[PDB]
DNA sequence: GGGTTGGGGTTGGG
RNA sequence: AUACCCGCUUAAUUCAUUCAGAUCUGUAAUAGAACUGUCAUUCAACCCCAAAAAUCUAGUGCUGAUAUAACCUUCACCAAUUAGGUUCAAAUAAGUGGUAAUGCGGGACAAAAGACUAUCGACAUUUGAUACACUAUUUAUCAAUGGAUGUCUUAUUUU
């Protein structure tokens, strides 16, 4: 079967595209056109360039460019003149590589932008190419072909032809959208409960005022006649009249009332605010917890909303049954998650058009065209639903509640009464003022920065016993001519610091940024441990508390000024990158295009004017590849320049004059840099790397002074250290404590996790709380101290799992959405730690087992939501899956194809291309059986799947088991032929398979892989 | 424990019919010394859905079949004829019934559920045959009323129940009655004692309801055995002569319609319809008026071969004459008040009233269509 | 009299 | 749980009143009584890094298996634990957690073959052809097809 390969050729990939009919390298094209002959001699560099250059065309034009004996080939014009002639011949066409950064004016061409690819076009290789070709043929070759030149080991740069991005590109009604997002984060409070004074409910105090304030709905195009509009206006008048008779205080007191000790909490808050001395930490934590335990329940809020709706909206506006359906769906909407939303169709598909009685049709289409009448009335029913919701429900929730999410509860939603949130805000302000925030006056801040930079907003998330402030910088000042926010202003410096991050990795400290770096460091340490001979290992884990706020602005500025890794001037280049996806190559239904095999990404890069080794000036890109598969890059014509002085000014401004607002009250930071800026992580990493390299001198020489293996990484403020010497670990702890004492920062909770036990009295570590565990846990990862294997940490309950899942389903692209979602869920974390250099076969099997067990529970809500819609009413799916078991067939197809793709990717990641195809197939079958067994075991108890689907899944699992057994049996005969010589990895795989006795059954490996 | 359950079940219905014979005779009672109202309601209700009663009832089985699991509400029992007599609150009555049946042996009860559950499901037809074997047919009963005497004197063999019809015939005790025995073995034993009857006389004529006329004391199976031939002769006989049945069935559907079913004024003819206009468009144009009508697409101008004059004319038969007049008002096109309409982009002419002879002929072929509609089904059925 | 590029989508670490 | 039909659902005072302005009273300074205005920079959505990406009509070795097996069985649902069955599918379960539960009051025709012109080209069906729709529509006419529908049965209250 088709397998993914780590090594691929651009020509081979291009020959698999149906649109392109002629694909060949330049040398063979020239030989076919007889412009050159084999007996002719050329320079070795020119020959290599001709061989490596790849051209392609939509049609076969070899005859058109055949050598003509009418006139020889001699060149007298310049290469620029030939290029200008070709560009002029191109005319009005505006999608070609050669036109980038230039414009045509009559028979004159003008260059006005920087294009880094022009060097290849005007190179001596292209000069000799033109000399061989001739002007008249070159001008048309630059248009009729797509030219790709190799500039790296696997990279190619397109220099001519139609831009590749061009290949990556009667109306129907679209219903409005429920504005659910407006409910969150409303800090406003009013003397009388109800809605905002700006609403039409309060603005009215006749039909004239209501019409004026509700024109947007009154003059809608869905209304058939003026009588319908008048009836709707009368209904709105009745709604407005009914609204003013609602006792909001009584409703609140009945359904969602304040706790009994609310007065006590208010008195405590007032006393804490008025107290001059610092408040008691445990008392404040208890007050925080007591305030946070006053949340309202979903059922309570649903009853509140239902009671509000019933006595305010006439029952005949929607119909007797439709009103009840809407009320029932209101609860589902209420309990709906943060980044999730409902749709109008969710109500329309379940109510009946004919229930409405006041609907009138100008033409008697009720009996002639029932479907047309139904559509016409649906267009009005949806409008009514959207109006009711977005005009009553959302404003009430916004005005009378603060709605947000907690710290460690994921995406789950919580509600709090407004006075409780006012008390929480006062207490949080009191807490922040003493530590890091100060009330500020606009007189102090200079007007230059005042008009040059926008300010930020502050948001508070509840936490167990405390809070968690978050400051945002999305806003932009309409006045003072500001059109960008802080991130848009600073993304240039962000690019510069991202460039800095590359040499920040290994030069001046121990900093890591991605799982690839973590994995390669782990692999190197594992190899060194293997060389040493598997001795005992000890680990220590600690982290910094509030790293961002503990940053010295003067020290950071001094480091920035004296750091030579940042050059004076930089240039910004933009380019497009085309990269191979994770899809195997089809072997030759007819519509095959570039997006089927390549992914388009937009990239920016900053480069210095030095004669650097990477010579970015020659190429225009800097990309890292983990495989030999090719990729294509095309440049752009939008360059930018950034100077170190501008970065210095930005850093000084953000360090000194950082201004944020809260409840229309301005604040200013006193220490550290604000979290949430795009440069904060890199700046923090650099700042702490300086101190850690200052205080970790001994580690630089320890590995050869006494030959001790030791590994230290720091991700942002989190530290992990594994070594062989308890003395080395203790020395590191002591040095880190000394550095913290000297630089005025501290570690979180005074807690440290170790693998050993030592007397803390000797090293003045009495205040520390040492926790001893035999299994290390770092950044959510689980590491063994015995086999030195790594696997991720997964939750254990469906309630925990569901809190972090947002479900969004659209009928238009069900197949694509579900396939991509399942693919992402499986490949989220497993691909980054499936390195065979780290785990053994058993370790990989266990990792896959646990990850699949987590992912199935993760994805279960998706099919639960899917079953709420019957696909038999949709032709697009019924024609493909019948009408009896459409849902079951659709789910089976999705699961089967997703599992097959995941297994193929897993085999590609695990094995190299040199391994035997039989071994690859056997391992793929084993993985498929594991996944299907997990899925079947999970789903065998569910009631919705209890019938038709389970038999199909059991059949699939049985087929996979049979195929695995058959492959294992045939592999013995295959190897017995002596036709193949096995390497060490193949021998290891054979030994593993024979030890686990995969020939007969799987019962041997299950205890080893399912152990927890 | 089905083997336990089966034996456990067989005890219950035995205790049930045991109580039934006692309560009708009022032989035993606990009265009010130790309440026992719980046992009284127990006997009452699991008799109310005992096998024999449901065999006679055949309704509570349906009502429990309505429920998915067949668990049924307590409230249904409160409306019963002789249940409310307990007296002395429905929220309390449900708890009383529930803790009365909490130790019951045929009713599953738990977690204060609102439903009650007989512990053995359906098995209606199987009980029908077993009871039929146990039942016995009696056809020697003079009209004398000695029901209590009958039950007190028939204490000779174990009898499940005596089904004496009431008021089906004249007076109270005229019917020939039905009796079931404890088992098929008990019925065979009663047959062994040749014509088991009152002890003073079992083979000869006597007094009272059991006066022993033509002594047809046989079980249900031989009762149907003797039924078989006599019933089947009458049931089969000979098939009805099918030649004239359709002609007889013509009359009402054929020869009165034009004035009884649809009045002659309800018919409206349309002319000058261009060829190439499918009748769907024409019926849509008539539907534009909104009334109910029958469309006879006039292509056969002879009005009773594939007539060549296709789509030229049309016939509309409304349900009501007043609706026809309302359509005429609608067809009175207010722009010109002309008896015409446009179909497929072409204006065609309509006829408000047709001469009564042509109306009668059109109704005649309409009734011919009705007769052949009745003929197709009649010939279809005549072979069965 | 016009004018970055505005989104779509929401997982797992920090 | 058919949740089939109907009705209302503690239906009654306030649990509570930020910020700002404007009054009265008191105070060794605290406070108390009453009033008015009020989402926003008019839009709200935190960031870093990495992940995936068909214009998803295109797709399975469509599936021979491990009685050391797989299925099935409880008065809602889910989460789990035990007992019992069956050999390509049916029969009869016992606990333990969480969650839905509102609640009351009133209500509750059978079935295997018939007698059936009682009605119907104005009956009903799988379809199949056309139009009206299509983002998860509730259908009109011809074609074909043959029963369908409605009563009485055979049956009846410790219903």
PDB file of N, CA, C and O (backbone and C1' of nucleotides) in Angstrom, chain B residues 20 23 48 69 81 108 113 115 168 235 249 252-253 261 279 287 296 317 370 374 380, chain D residues 1-2 75-76 94 105 107-108 114 117 120-122 140-142 146 156-159:
ATOM      1  N   UNK B  20     -60.292 -15.692  45.572  1.00  0.00           N
ATOM      2  CA  UNK B  20     -61.488 -15.337  44.814  1.00  0.00           C
ATOM      3  C   UNK B  20     -62.667 -16.229  45.182  1.00  0.00           C
ATOM      4  O   UNK B  20     -63.792 -15.743  45.350  1.00  0.00           O
ATOM      5  N   UNK B  23     -63.727 -15.028  48.768  1.00  0.00           N
ATOM      6  CA  UNK B  23     -64.349 -13.716  48.919  1.00  0.00           C
ATOM      7  C   UNK B  23     -65.772 -13.713  48.376  1.00  0.00           C
ATOM      8  O   UNK B  23     -66.655 -13.053  48.935  1.00  0.00           O
ATOM      9  N   UNK B  48     -57.142  -8.067  40.082  1.00  0.00           N
ATOM     10  CA  UNK B  48     -57.556  -7.179  39.002  1.00  0.00           C
ATOM     11  C   UNK B  48     -56.699  -7.376  37.763  1.00  0.00           C
ATOM     12  O   UNK B  48     -57.175  -7.176  36.640  1.00  0.00           O
ATOM     13  N   UNK B  69     -42.338  -0.215  29.131  1.00  0.00           N
ATOM     14  CA  UNK B  69     -41.926  -1.342  29.956  1.00  0.00           C
ATOM     15  C   UNK B  69     -43.120  -2.057  30.572  1.00  0.00           C
ATOM     16  O   UNK B  69     -42.939  -3.092  31.222  1.00  0.00           O
ATOM     17  N   UNK B  81     -63.737   0.234  40.529  1.00  0.00           N
ATOM     18  CA  UNK B  81     -65.085   0.205  41.090  1.00  0.00           C
ATOM     19  C   UNK B  81     -65.074  -0.094  42.585  1.00  0.00           C
ATOM     20  O   UNK B  81     -65.784   0.555  43.361  1.00  0.00           O
ATOM     21  N   UNK B 108     -43.027  -5.806  41.382  1.00  0.00           N
ATOM     22  CA  UNK B 108     -41.773  -5.139  41.699  1.00  0.00           C
ATOM     23  C   UNK B 108     -42.024  -3.694  42.108  1.00  0.00           C
ATOM     24  O   UNK B 108     -42.741  -2.952  41.429  1.00  0.00           O
ATOM     25  N   UNK B 113     -41.069   4.615  43.018  1.00  0.00           N
ATOM     26  CA  UNK B 113     -41.481   4.862  41.644  1.00  0.00           C
ATOM     27  C   UNK B 113     -42.991   5.056  41.570  1.00  0.00           C
ATOM     28  O   UNK B 113     -43.754   4.502  42.366  1.00  0.00           O
ATOM     29  N   UNK B 115     -44.773   3.946  39.223  1.00  0.00           N
ATOM     30  CA  UNK B 115     -45.299   2.854  38.423  1.00  0.00           C
ATOM     31  C   UNK B 115     -45.232   1.542  39.194  1.00  0.00           C
ATOM     32  O   UNK B 115     -44.401   1.369  40.089  1.00  0.00           O
ATOM     33  N   UNK B 168     -77.231 -11.436  30.028  1.00  0.00           N
ATOM     34  CA  UNK B 168     -77.020 -11.596  28.592  1.00  0.00           C
ATOM     35  C   UNK B 168     -78.293 -12.076  27.910  1.00  0.00           C
ATOM     36  O   UNK B 168     -78.669 -11.573  26.844  1.00  0.00           O
ATOM     37  N   UNK B 235     -70.136 -21.370   7.120  1.00  0.00           N
ATOM     38  CA  UNK B 235     -69.119 -20.396   6.738  1.00  0.00           C
ATOM     39  C   UNK B 235     -68.715 -20.555   5.277  1.00  0.00           C
ATOM     40  O   UNK B 235     -68.525 -19.559   4.568  1.00  0.00           O
ATOM     41  N   UNK B 249     -74.215  -2.611  -7.299  1.00  0.00           N
ATOM     42  CA  UNK B 249     -73.472  -1.562  -6.611  1.00  0.00           C
ATOM     43  C   UNK B 249     -73.349  -0.284  -7.430  1.00  0.00           C
ATOM     44  O   UNK B 249     -72.861   0.723  -6.906  1.00  0.00           O
ATOM     45  N   UNK B 252     -76.251   3.694  -6.392  1.00  0.00           N
ATOM     46  CA  UNK B 252     -76.065   4.881  -5.560  1.00  0.00           C
ATOM     47  C   UNK B 252     -74.902   5.736  -6.051  1.00  0.00           C
ATOM     48  O   UNK B 252     -75.011   6.966  -6.108  1.00  0.00           O
ATOM     49  N   UNK B 253     -73.783   5.106  -6.407  1.00  0.00           N
ATOM     50  CA  UNK B 253     -72.618   5.865  -6.847  1.00  0.00           C
ATOM     51  C   UNK B 253     -72.774   6.407  -8.262  1.00  0.00           C
ATOM     52  O   UNK B 253     -71.970   7.246  -8.681  1.00  0.00           O
ATOM     53  N   UNK B 261     -74.695  14.194  -4.826  1.00  0.00           N
ATOM     54  CA  UNK B 261     -73.310  14.350  -4.395  1.00  0.00           C
ATOM     55  C   UNK B 261     -72.741  15.691  -4.845  1.00  0.00           C
ATOM     56  O   UNK B 261     -72.287  16.495  -4.024  1.00  0.00           O
ATOM     57  N   UNK B 279     -51.777  19.347 -17.922  1.00  0.00           N
ATOM     58  CA  UNK B 279     -52.930  19.573 -17.059  1.00  0.00           C
ATOM     59  C   UNK B 279     -52.531  20.031 -15.663  1.00  0.00           C
ATOM     60  O   UNK B 279     -53.375  20.568 -14.938  1.00  0.00           O
ATOM     61  N   UNK B 287     -56.650  26.118  -9.081  1.00  0.00           N
ATOM     62  CA  UNK B 287     -56.333  26.198  -7.659  1.00  0.00           C
ATOM     63  C   UNK B 287     -56.076  27.630  -7.221  1.00  0.00           C
ATOM     64  O   UNK B 287     -56.209  27.948  -6.034  1.00  0.00           O
ATOM     65  N   UNK B 296     -61.609  17.381 -14.993  1.00  0.00           N
ATOM     66  CA  UNK B 296     -61.688  16.374 -16.045  1.00  0.00           C
ATOM     67  C   UNK B 296     -61.080  17.004 -17.294  1.00  0.00           C
ATOM     68  O   UNK B 296     -61.734  17.772 -18.003  1.00  0.00           O
ATOM     69  N   UNK B 317     -65.185  20.275 -11.945  1.00  0.00           N
ATOM     70  CA  UNK B 317     -66.325  19.849 -11.136  1.00  0.00           C
ATOM     71  C   UNK B 317     -66.062  20.252  -9.689  1.00  0.00           C
ATOM     72  O   UNK B 317     -65.308  19.583  -8.977  1.00  0.00           O
ATOM     73  N   UNK B 370     -66.804   6.088 -12.078  1.00  0.00           N
ATOM     74  CA  UNK B 370     -67.028   5.640 -10.705  1.00  0.00           C
ATOM     75  C   UNK B 370     -67.367   4.153 -10.659  1.00  0.00           C
ATOM     76  O   UNK B 370     -66.872   3.413  -9.797  1.00  0.00           O
ATOM     77  N   UNK B 374     -65.291   1.006  -9.006  1.00  0.00           N
ATOM     78  CA  UNK B 374     -65.879   0.019  -8.108  1.00  0.00           C
ATOM     79  C   UNK B 374     -65.755  -1.396  -8.689  1.00  0.00           C
ATOM     80  O   UNK B 374     -65.796  -2.382  -7.953  1.00  0.00           O
ATOM     81  N   UNK B 380     -61.241  -7.687  -8.217  1.00  0.00           N
ATOM     82  CA  UNK B 380     -60.071  -8.076  -7.432  1.00  0.00           C
ATOM     83  C   UNK B 380     -60.467  -8.920  -6.227  1.00  0.00           C
ATOM     84  O   UNK B 380     -59.783  -9.893  -5.889  1.00  0.00           O
TER      85      UNK B 380
ATOM     86  P     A D   1     -46.703   5.254  29.513  1.00  0.00           P
ATOM     87  O5'   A D   1     -45.311   5.874  29.051  1.00  0.00           O
ATOM     88  C5'   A D   1     -44.668   6.884  29.822  1.00  0.00           C
ATOM     89  C4'   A D   1     -43.604   7.595  29.025  1.00  0.00           C
ATOM     90  C3'   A D   1     -42.424   6.721  28.608  1.00  0.00           C
ATOM     91  O3'   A D   1     -41.918   7.175  27.355  1.00  0.00           O
ATOM     92  C1'   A D   1     -41.654   8.478  29.984  1.00  0.00           C
ATOM     93  P     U D   2     -42.447   6.518  25.988  1.00  0.00           P
ATOM     94  O5'   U D   2     -44.030   6.488  26.164  1.00  0.00           O
ATOM     95  C5'   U D   2     -44.835   5.671  25.333  1.00  0.00           C
ATOM     96  C4'   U D   2     -46.072   6.397  24.866  1.00  0.00           C
ATOM     97  C3'   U D   2     -45.996   7.911  24.815  1.00  0.00           C
ATOM     98  O3'   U D   2     -45.263   8.407  23.708  1.00  0.00           O
ATOM     99  C1'   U D   2     -48.076   7.236  25.726  1.00  0.00           C
ATOM    100  P     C D  75     -37.127  -5.020  34.270  1.00  0.00           P
ATOM    101  O5'   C D  75     -37.280  -3.441  34.122  1.00  0.00           O
ATOM    102  C5'   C D  75     -37.485  -2.615  35.263  1.00  0.00           C
ATOM    103  C4'   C D  75     -37.815  -1.195  34.875  1.00  0.00           C
ATOM    104  C3'   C D  75     -36.847  -0.137  35.398  1.00  0.00           C
ATOM    105  O3'   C D  75     -36.767   0.938  34.463  1.00  0.00           O
ATOM    106  C1'   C D  75     -39.009   0.277  36.259  1.00  0.00           C
ATOM    107  P     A D  76     -35.509   1.054  33.471  1.00  0.00           P
ATOM    108  O5'   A D  76     -35.678   2.490  32.802  1.00  0.00           O
ATOM    109  C5'   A D  76     -36.049   3.618  33.581  1.00  0.00           C
ATOM    110  C4'   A D  76     -36.036   4.889  32.770  1.00  0.00           C
ATOM    111  C3'   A D  76     -34.689   5.291  32.189  1.00  0.00           C
ATOM    112  O3'   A D  76     -34.397   4.634  30.968  1.00  0.00           O
ATOM    113  C1'   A D  76     -35.646   7.145  33.282  1.00  0.00           C
ATOM    114  P     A D  94     -34.125  -7.032  39.287  1.00  0.00           P
ATOM    115  O5'   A D  94     -32.848  -7.290  40.201  1.00  0.00           O
ATOM    116  C5'   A D  94     -32.884  -8.256  41.243  1.00  0.00           C
ATOM    117  C4'   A D  94     -31.711  -8.102  42.176  1.00  0.00           C
ATOM    118  C3'   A D  94     -31.273  -6.674  42.458  1.00  0.00           C
ATOM    119  O3'   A D  94     -32.069  -6.036  43.440  1.00  0.00           O
ATOM    120  C1'   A D  94     -29.380  -7.985  41.939  1.00  0.00           C
ATOM    121  P     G D 105     -53.532  14.745  43.662  1.00  0.00           P
ATOM    122  O5'   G D 105     -54.822  15.177  42.837  1.00  0.00           O
ATOM    123  C5'   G D 105     -55.629  16.251  43.291  1.00  0.00           C
ATOM    124  C4'   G D 105     -56.362  16.928  42.161  1.00  0.00           C
ATOM    125  C3'   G D 105     -56.921  16.029  41.077  1.00  0.00           C
ATOM    126  O3'   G D 105     -58.095  15.342  41.465  1.00  0.00           O
ATOM    127  C1'   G D 105     -55.901  17.907  40.087  1.00  0.00           C
ATOM    128  P     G D 107     -60.908  11.612  36.800  1.00  0.00           P
ATOM    129  O5'   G D 107     -60.573  11.412  35.255  1.00  0.00           O
ATOM    130  C5'   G D 107     -61.589  11.568  34.279  1.00  0.00           C
ATOM    131  C4'   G D 107     -61.030  11.825  32.901  1.00  0.00           C
ATOM    132  C3'   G D 107     -60.484  10.628  32.143  1.00  0.00           C
ATOM    133  O3'   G D 107     -61.495   9.806  31.585  1.00  0.00           O
ATOM    134  C1'   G D 107     -59.054  12.496  31.857  1.00  0.00           C
ATOM    135  P     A D 108     -61.219   8.238  31.366  1.00  0.00           P
ATOM    136  O5'   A D 108     -61.266   8.037  29.784  1.00  0.00           O
ATOM    137  C5'   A D 108     -60.350   8.710  28.925  1.00  0.00           C
ATOM    138  C4'   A D 108     -59.440   7.747  28.204  1.00  0.00           C
ATOM    139  C3'   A D 108     -59.479   6.307  28.713  1.00  0.00           C
ATOM    140  O3'   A D 108     -59.206   5.414  27.633  1.00  0.00           O
ATOM    141  C1'   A D 108     -57.300   7.153  28.948  1.00  0.00           C
ATOM    142  P     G D 114     -60.719 -13.710   5.556  1.00  0.00           P
ATOM    143  O5'   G D 114     -61.769 -12.650   6.107  1.00  0.00           O
ATOM    144  C5'   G D 114     -63.054 -12.525   5.520  1.00  0.00           C
ATOM    145  C4'   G D 114     -64.141 -12.914   6.487  1.00  0.00           C
ATOM    146  C3'   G D 114     -65.468 -12.193   6.309  1.00  0.00           C
ATOM    147  O3'   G D 114     -66.269 -12.804   5.315  1.00  0.00           O
ATOM    148  C1'   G D 114     -64.841 -12.167   8.597  1.00  0.00           C
ATOM    149  P     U D 117     -71.061  -5.436  -0.108  1.00  0.00           P
ATOM    150  O5'   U D 117     -72.358  -4.893  -0.854  1.00  0.00           O
ATOM    151  C5'   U D 117     -72.920  -3.606  -0.533  1.00  0.00           C
ATOM    152  C4'   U D 117     -71.823  -2.595  -0.303  1.00  0.00           C
ATOM    153  C3'   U D 117     -72.246  -1.336   0.439  1.00  0.00           C
ATOM    154  O3'   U D 117     -72.212  -1.497   1.854  1.00  0.00           O
ATOM    155  C1'   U D 117     -71.107  -0.725  -1.536  1.00  0.00           C
ATOM    156  P     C D 120     -68.669   7.714  -2.985  1.00  0.00           P
ATOM    157  O5'   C D 120     -67.170   7.968  -3.453  1.00  0.00           O
ATOM    158  C5'   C D 120     -66.383   8.978  -2.842  1.00  0.00           C
ATOM    159  C4'   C D 120     -64.913   8.663  -2.935  1.00  0.00           C
ATOM    160  C3'   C D 120     -64.461   8.006  -4.227  1.00  0.00           C
ATOM    161  O3'   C D 120     -64.311   8.928  -5.288  1.00  0.00           O
ATOM    162  C1'   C D 120     -63.468   6.910  -2.375  1.00  0.00           C
ATOM    163  P     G D 121     -64.871   8.562  -6.747  1.00  0.00           P
ATOM    164  O5'   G D 121     -63.560   8.464  -7.639  1.00  0.00           O
ATOM    165  C5'   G D 121     -62.669   7.365  -7.515  1.00  0.00           C
ATOM    166  C4'   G D 121     -61.733   7.314  -8.690  1.00  0.00           C
ATOM    167  C3'   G D 121     -60.945   8.591  -8.943  1.00  0.00           C
ATOM    168  O3'   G D 121     -59.778   8.699  -8.148  1.00  0.00           O
ATOM    169  C1'   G D 121     -62.000   7.950 -10.935  1.00  0.00           C
ATOM    170  P     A D 122     -59.238  10.147  -7.701  1.00  0.00           P
ATOM    171  O5'   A D 122     -60.550  10.939  -7.261  1.00  0.00           O
ATOM    172  C5'   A D 122     -61.209  10.647  -6.032  1.00  0.00           C
ATOM    173  C4'   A D 122     -60.967  11.720  -4.999  1.00  0.00           C
ATOM    174  C3'   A D 122     -61.643  11.493  -3.648  1.00  0.00           C
ATOM    175  O3'   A D 122     -60.812  12.016  -2.613  1.00  0.00           O
ATOM    176  C1'   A D 122     -62.383  13.534  -4.561  1.00  0.00           C
ATOM    177  P     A D 140     -50.352  17.578  -1.197  1.00  0.00           P
ATOM    178  O5'   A D 140     -50.404  17.896  -2.758  1.00  0.00           O
ATOM    179  C5'   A D 140     -50.934  19.127  -3.222  1.00  0.00           C
ATOM    180  C4'   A D 140     -50.683  19.328  -4.695  1.00  0.00           C
ATOM    181  C3'   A D 140     -51.068  18.182  -5.613  1.00  0.00           C
ATOM    182  O3'   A D 140     -52.457  18.127  -5.883  1.00  0.00           O
ATOM    183  C1'   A D 140     -48.939  18.998  -6.221  1.00  0.00           C
ATOM    184  P     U D 141     -53.131  16.749  -6.364  1.00  0.00           P
ATOM    185  O5'   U D 141     -52.691  16.617  -7.888  1.00  0.00           O
ATOM    186  C5'   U D 141     -53.067  17.597  -8.843  1.00  0.00           C
ATOM    187  C4'   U D 141     -52.363  17.380 -10.158  1.00  0.00           C
ATOM    188  C3'   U D 141     -52.494  15.989 -10.753  1.00  0.00           C
ATOM    189  O3'   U D 141     -53.720  15.796 -11.432  1.00  0.00           O
ATOM    190  C1'   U D 141     -50.235  16.669 -10.837  1.00  0.00           C
ATOM    191  P     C D 142     -54.150  14.326 -11.913  1.00  0.00           P
ATOM    192  O5'   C D 142     -53.498  14.195 -13.359  1.00  0.00           O
ATOM    193  C5'   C D 142     -53.554  12.973 -14.075  1.00  0.00           C
ATOM    194  C4'   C D 142     -52.277  12.722 -14.832  1.00  0.00           C
ATOM    195  C3'   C D 142     -51.830  11.271 -14.902  1.00  0.00           C
ATOM    196  O3'   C D 142     -52.487  10.541 -15.923  1.00  0.00           O
ATOM    197  C1'   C D 142     -50.008  12.614 -14.240  1.00  0.00           C
ATOM    198  P     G D 146     -52.708  -4.295  -9.369  1.00  0.00           P
ATOM    199  O5'   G D 146     -53.227  -4.547  -7.888  1.00  0.00           O
ATOM    200  C5'   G D 146     -52.305  -4.825  -6.841  1.00  0.00           C
ATOM    201  C4'   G D 146     -52.757  -4.239  -5.526  1.00  0.00           C
ATOM    202  C3'   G D 146     -54.129  -4.704  -5.045  1.00  0.00           C
ATOM    203  O3'   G D 146     -54.121  -4.776  -3.623  1.00  0.00           O
ATOM    204  C1'   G D 146     -54.134  -2.360  -5.279  1.00  0.00           C
ATOM    205  P     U D 156     -68.568  -6.931  24.072  1.00  0.00           P
ATOM    206  O5'   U D 156     -69.270  -6.676  25.478  1.00  0.00           O
ATOM    207  C5'   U D 156     -68.595  -6.976  26.692  1.00  0.00           C
ATOM    208  C4'   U D 156     -69.378  -7.946  27.540  1.00  0.00           C
ATOM    209  C3'   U D 156     -68.922  -8.084  28.984  1.00  0.00           C
ATOM    210  O3'   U D 156     -69.400  -7.042  29.815  1.00  0.00           O
ATOM    211  C1'   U D 156     -69.252 -10.230  28.059  1.00  0.00           C
ATOM    212  P     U D 157     -68.370  -5.992  30.460  1.00  0.00           P
ATOM    213  O5'   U D 157     -67.694  -6.798  31.655  1.00  0.00           O
ATOM    214  C5'   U D 157     -68.428  -7.109  32.834  1.00  0.00           C
ATOM    215  C4'   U D 157     -67.556  -7.054  34.065  1.00  0.00           C
ATOM    216  C3'   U D 157     -68.310  -6.945  35.387  1.00  0.00           C
ATOM    217  O3'   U D 157     -67.559  -7.597  36.410  1.00  0.00           O
ATOM    218  C1'   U D 157     -66.937  -5.048  35.112  1.00  0.00           C
ATOM    219  P     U D 158     -68.305  -8.233  37.683  1.00  0.00           P
ATOM    220  O5'   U D 158     -67.130  -8.508  38.722  1.00  0.00           O
ATOM    221  C5'   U D 158     -65.932  -7.746  38.686  1.00  0.00           C
ATOM    222  C4'   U D 158     -65.693  -7.024  39.988  1.00  0.00           C
ATOM    223  C3'   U D 158     -64.250  -6.643  40.274  1.00  0.00           C
ATOM    224  O3'   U D 158     -63.796  -5.481  39.580  1.00  0.00           O
ATOM    225  C1'   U D 158     -65.179  -7.675  42.186  1.00  0.00           C
ATOM    226  P     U D 159     -64.552  -4.060  39.678  1.00  0.00           P
ATOM    227  O5'   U D 159     -63.716  -3.117  38.705  1.00  0.00           O
ATOM    228  C5'   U D 159     -62.794  -3.666  37.771  1.00  0.00           C
ATOM    229  C4'   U D 159     -63.386  -3.742  36.386  1.00  0.00           C
ATOM    230  C3'   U D 159     -62.418  -4.177  35.287  1.00  0.00           C
ATOM    231  O3'   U D 159     -63.126  -4.931  34.306  1.00  0.00           O
ATOM    232  C1'   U D 159     -63.261  -2.032  34.788  1.00  0.00           C
TER     233        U D 159
END
